[PDB]
Amino acid sequence: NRLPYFINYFFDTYLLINEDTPVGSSVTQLLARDLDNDHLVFGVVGEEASRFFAVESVTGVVWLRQPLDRETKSEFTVEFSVSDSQGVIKGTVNIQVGDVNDNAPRFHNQPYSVRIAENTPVGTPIFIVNATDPDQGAGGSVLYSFQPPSSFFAIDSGRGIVSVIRGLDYEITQAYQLQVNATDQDKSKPLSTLANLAITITDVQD
Ligand SMILES: [Ca+2]
Ligand SMILES: [Ca+2]
Ligand SMILES: [Ca+2]
Ligand SMILES: [Ca+2]
Ligand SMILES: [Ca+2]
Ligand SMILES: [Ca+2]
Ligand SMILES: [Ca+2]
Ligand SMILES: [Cl-]
């Protein structure tokens, strides 16, 4: 009696599952060959595997039980089983959760407040802002801008540096309530968030 064996590509390489996959969704179908043409029955082995993947006994279709996330867990290995009526064969399948852009940039220590004198020289960096993004590639890289734009302050798109660009005057304007806007470079469906930045201006002699 000749034992059964798997054939699918994802026993040598890896199986990709995009993290947006609704639960109850089929992820693949396990395919095996018995040389003696036995009606094979498939299963899922382990408890790590079994709380993620349910396997249709006969068809070898594999579907998703608990939802996926790459922010939590990027990759993990799972072991599947196929029966010969007398003997179980199992094989190691490296899963890899495929990323999507489901995280808008997240600020740290907002709101923001700065205090500078009217005489602050033009080009003086006065604050630095930081927004993180955990996503993959352009989903997880940030670009800072003002919103609306400002005439008196700029912000470095790369490093999030708030510099002075037009000279200030206390007798004209004693405060400036700006909104820093952080955005990710995912060209198809991008995300963006806002932080308040309240620059108070201090009087001097003129
Ligand atoms: Ca056999
Ligand atoms: Ca996610
Ligand atoms: Ca993601
Ligand atoms: Ca993102
Ligand atoms: Ca990042
Ligand atoms: Ca003045
Ligand atoms: Ca003054
Ligand atoms: Cl805020």
Angstrom distance (rounded) from CA 106 to CA 67: 23
Burial class (CB in 10 A: 0-12, 13-18, 19+), 188: exposed
Extents of the domains making up the chain: 1-100, 101-206
- Contact (Cβ atoms closer than 8 angstroms) between residue 27 and residue 78: no
Experimental method: X-ray
- Contact (Cβ atoms closer than 8 angstroms) between residue 53 and residue 27: yes
* C-alpha 200 to ligand 6 mean position (Å): 14
* C-alpha 119 to ligand 7 mean position (Å): 9
* C-alpha 203 to ligand 5 mean position (Å): 40
Q: How many CB atoms lie within 10 A of CB 163?
A: 15
* C-alpha 167 to ligand 7 mean position (Å): 13
Angstrom distance (rounded) from CA 144 to CA 155: 7
Q: Resolution in angstroms, to 1 decimal, for this deposition?
A: 3.1
Ligand nearest the Cα of residue 84 is 1
Distances in Å between the Cα of 175 and the Cα atoms of 25, 121, 126, 147, 202 are: 54, 17, 14, 17, 9
Tell me how long the chain is: 206
Residues pairing with 193 in the sheet: 182
Angstrom distance (rounded) from CA 36 to CA 190: 54
Residues pairing with 112 in the sheet: 197
